[PDB]
Amino acid sequence: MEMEKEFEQIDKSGSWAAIYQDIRHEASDFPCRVAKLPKNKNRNRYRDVSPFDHSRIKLHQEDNDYINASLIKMEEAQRSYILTQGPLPNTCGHFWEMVWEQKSRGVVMLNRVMEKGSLKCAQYWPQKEEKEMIFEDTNLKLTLISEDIKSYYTVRQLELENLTTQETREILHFHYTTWPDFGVPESPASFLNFLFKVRESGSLSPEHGPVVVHCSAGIGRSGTFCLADTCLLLMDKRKDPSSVDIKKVLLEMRKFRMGLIQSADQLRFSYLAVIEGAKFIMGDSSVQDQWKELSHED
Template sequence: MASQTEKEFAEFDNNKIWTEIFQRLKNEASLLTLGDDFSSKISREPQNRRKNRYRDVSPYDHSRVILSGKNDYINASLVEVPEAGRKYILTQGPLDQTMSDFWQMAWEQESRAIVMLNRTIEKLAIKCAQYWPLGADFGCEEDMYFPQCGLKTGEKREILHFHYTTWPDFGVPSSPNAFLLFLHVIRQTGSLDADVGPSVVHCSAGIGRSGTFCLVDSCLMVVEKKQSLQAINVRETLIHMRSYRMGLIQTPDQLRFSYLAILQGAHAILHGTGLESVSTKQNHVEGPPPPLRSSSLQQPSTALASQDHSSYEQQISVSTEDLLADMDSAPPPPLFPKKGAQAIGHSLQRQAGSSKWEEDDEEDEEFDQLIDREESGSDSEEEAKAVELRHRIREERKKQTMEQLRKMKERQRRSERWRPYKKFYRPSLYIGLAVLVGVAGVIVYKYLM
């Protein structure tokens, strides 16, 4: 007998009414969140406005994450799904001026992992600050320090950073397979379990891709606990989650993808094969899951050491570029060049911001096919030239991306410096124009006389 979720998916798909269903969900959630209980007044206070990436995405006062210290605001919400035994912190991609708050939150909430679902640059726009160090390979520092957090206990912790790099803004992955494998890898580390702090999940706004991730994971947890697809109601779960953070899941496509991933993952769980079997079986990819990126977070300076490769990480991390390239049918952005063991911890980090993604897709596929032969040590002259060309092109792309990021950040800084003075110059400009028009009128009048 088909479950309610399966019946709903078939009905919505056959009748092509996902847009209508999505709008109904938005309306129901809006009615639920009317009133003072769901205010967002704190986010609109003058000292907090500059900490919001988007004007129309604010945390509810009742569920916002509260930092210690004089200014306790961060655009982040604690989302709870009791029937799944899950708690998540959904937040926006950090701004340059909120990176310290971001890491302070991760520390104070005792988060075990950060799940990043966007790239720092998408469609030539900055979607997230570079809040973790890129390291010496990219001409950057190995560590980042945030002394303004004011945490001084000398304690040190390790936080895992998971980065999904092929999920487009306002879009969905090409299939649920790669997503379910990604989710499986995170679950295997215990980062989402109830006995650790809530994981930090973010995209750019912290509502679309982040909401999709949490909805799928929560529903699959209920299926796993109850061992039945009948135990879940996707729409009610989403409406409940929206009572903690506004706007979760932004498009009808993301809603449809959530249903697909839930159904596919649920069948794998109920058949006893697990989420990893769905992904590897349907993509015909064999091998271990993608590697983790591990970061060290310590006091007193709350330093993030991205090159701290622990023995645990080395045991589960192998060269999986082929697996990552095959995870989605659409080719992902090209990889940065890597050097030996330093590839560990950066294997999921894809290049962002290249204006030549579309032009180079076929070229990337051709180069990816050479990876196996490159690693096997083939001495073919033709293959050696191809490998050399591949590394040269990636090096050039890295330089272009870093230069573009530098220019965009510089424009952003100039804009921030100019903003406080706009209100003074705008009236002066109007007065100047009025005087100029008045003088011109006098000249014309005298000429006519």
């Protein structure tokens, strides 16, 4: 693929840092005035990472509609994502309100609650069936329904109830649990298999609201997941699959949320994932089961 050829070129000339910086320089800059209002200071995990005003998700509250979350709307791919930061101790109700209001079916979590010995986000979902959580501020109830723990990821079914109306929905929680504390996976196989599991669940589909994707800041790994998904989707859809330019797709996504893909390592890994995932796309059926075996599930 023209992508693989470009990949090897960048590798041989050792120019990932320069290409990544090119991305940083060309990326959109839009205002985040709502995020930066003093009253919202504690709704932000990093003063460094803010949703643009034009693409931010608004809570349907009268008293403060702010949450650190962005709608990424990929026109050609016909795919939408909500990228958000890992919930804060005081924003878990907001988070689940957003999931309810946006009609999301899936939540994708790409970080551990604790990494590098520090808390990367709040424990925002119940860990035991018998101990449900109530978010009083937004009047929502959340119950662990089942949990399936595999080697590289865990999938949970949750029941989210609007206590105000007593309607309930099933939310799928996809938790990639093995992203290394430093660097990137090194083999894209298990990440790809995880992406396919999210796809297979229907969570990414047009009949639902946009999937909610988060890591700690909601730009790095989150970025990588959405960039890979969209590129793969576009290669599937277009008459000329080799016309898919990762950098152009990334820059398009950066119109909707800043800082997507946080290092040159993550960029390289994005190429790797797309390239590898493209094998299962041009006819190769017997490779979905070569990512299920290359990475265990025990």
